[PDB]
């Protein structure tokens, strides 16, 4: 098991811009503050999105397009280093009433989004290709 | 994009009272401690609830009543200032097995609820009417 | 209402081992570090899992087995003391696309899992049998 230790100090609440990508805005914020490791959470609504699941056998993602407004029922994830820059790994649950979709988040157009960011001060984990899963998991 | 910066220090785990409203109990706690900004998370189960989704075009909420015991599969949100008092904005996923419902949380009767409250020390965001969404979003 | 106060300081991001139980790995980590109270969060995917819901009348859990790879759409919980050792209480949402399952988490074989652990420094809550719900809730 890989263990990454950190200290917490700052906290951020963000109001994302309407009509822009959710993931892209967070990453822009991260770059601006120089945050390389963090825990992410959010709620709100999106105008559309692109999610997907990971085929654990073929070792590839399978995405789904959703071109309908949905509530961000749940949004959670983390920040780490990939290709020399802060990289967001986020999972979500979008929908309304009994209509629920979930998976790895690729993109989402924001309607109204409030994001909580908890930066983690310490060695930022780096994502490297992992043979076993076919994903880019933390190494050191 | 609006950015609100804070420092973290305290942490709270609460055991809510059976038969009382989930949102109301948290709000009472916040008033007592004078918490104006925070991140919220909870798990447990409820005896009933009122959730809803936001029609992004008509600009109004559409609620759903659930008068059946449900598990709190996911509860996340934040605290901010609205009408000069701590205001909770929470989204949830309630249900059992494959029966899942989700949305903006209005009310929930508690069965057993464990809440994690992470107060945020800094300028609390205030909610003001936003023309674009018809929602009450953070101004400053 | 019961209130447990804490101070936050450290933060941990863990990369769980493939093919091992999710809950057990976190618990081994908590024991090694001596964490008696904390907030938990995670995302990733599992190869199989066992969840369930609580019948609030009969006062007993009803389990559900899932022997199919699933994405961890949402994983949230807390750590506390039970039987004199760190005990995890976790709720999850597993699935893909519109196939979503949710409930109290009993076990899950890890495919790839990134866990965020926020230890809470203070008097750790202890779980004791509660007549009203039939669950083991926090006392003091
Ligand atoms: Zn993922
Ligand atoms: Zn909402
Ligand atoms: Zn539970």
The DSSP string of A80-128 is EEETTEEEEEEEEEEEEBTEEEEEEEEEEEEEEEEEEEEE-BSPPPBEE
The one-character DSSP state at B97 is: B
The kind and range of the H/E element at B34 are: none
| CA distance linking residue A86 with residue C3, whole number of Å | 36
Resolution in angstrom units:
2.0
Mutate to test the interface with C, among A42, A91, A97, A134 (most CBs of C within 10 A): A91
Both structure tokens of B53: 């989704």
A56 SS3 class: coil
Query: What is the domain extent for residue B133?
Result: 2-140
* Listed residue (A75, A44, A49) closest to A63, CA to CA: A49
- CA distances B63 to B15, B25, B59, B74, B99, Å, are 27, 21, 13, 18, 18
Mark the residues whose beta carbon lies below 5 A from ion ligand 1: A 104
Number of domains in chain C: 1
b or e along B11-43 (b: 16 or more beta carbons within 10 Å of the residue's beta carbon)?
A: bbbbbbeeeebbbebbbebbeebebbbbbbbbb
**Nearest-CA distance A136 → chain C (Å):** 10
**φ, ψ for residue C28 (rounded to 5)?**
-65, -40
Q: How was this structure determined?
A: X-ray
| CA distance linking residue B101 with residue B52, whole number of Å | 10
Angle (nearest 5°) at CA A105 between A46 and B115: 75
Residue B16 near residue B113, CB atoms below 8 Å = yes
Question: Which residues are CB-neighbours of C42 under 8 A, at least 6 positions away?
Answer: C22, C72, C75, C113, C114, C115, C116
Residue in C6, C53, C89 nearest the CB of B10: C6
User: Other C-beta atoms within 10 Å of C129: how many?
Assistant: 10
| CA distance linking residue A37 with residue A116, whole number of Å | 14
SS3 content of chain C, % helix, strand, coil (to 5): 10, 65, 25
| CATH code for the domain of A77 | 3.30.1330.80
- Residues of chain C with C-beta less than 8 angstroms from the C-beta of A57: 69
As a residue count, chain B comes to 140
């Amino acid at each position: 098991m890989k263990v990454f230790e950190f200290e917490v100090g700052k906290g951020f609440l963000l109001r994302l811009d309407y009509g822009k990508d959710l993931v892209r805005q967070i990453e822009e914020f991260l770059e601006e503050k120089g945050i390389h490791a963090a825990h992410i959470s959010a709620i709100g609504a999106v105008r559309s999105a692109v999610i997907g699941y990971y085929d654990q056998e073929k070792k590839e993602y399978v995405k789904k397009e959703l071109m309908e407004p949905l509530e961000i029922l749940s949004l959670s994830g983390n920040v780490s280093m990939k290709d020399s820059k802060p990289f967001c790994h986020i999972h979500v649950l979008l929908g309304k009433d009994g209509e629920v979709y979930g998976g790895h988040l690729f993109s989402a157009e924001v309607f109204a989004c409030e994001v909580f960011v908890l930066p983690l001060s310490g060695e930022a984990p780096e994502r490297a290709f992992d043979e076993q899963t076919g994903l880019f998991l933390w190494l050191e």
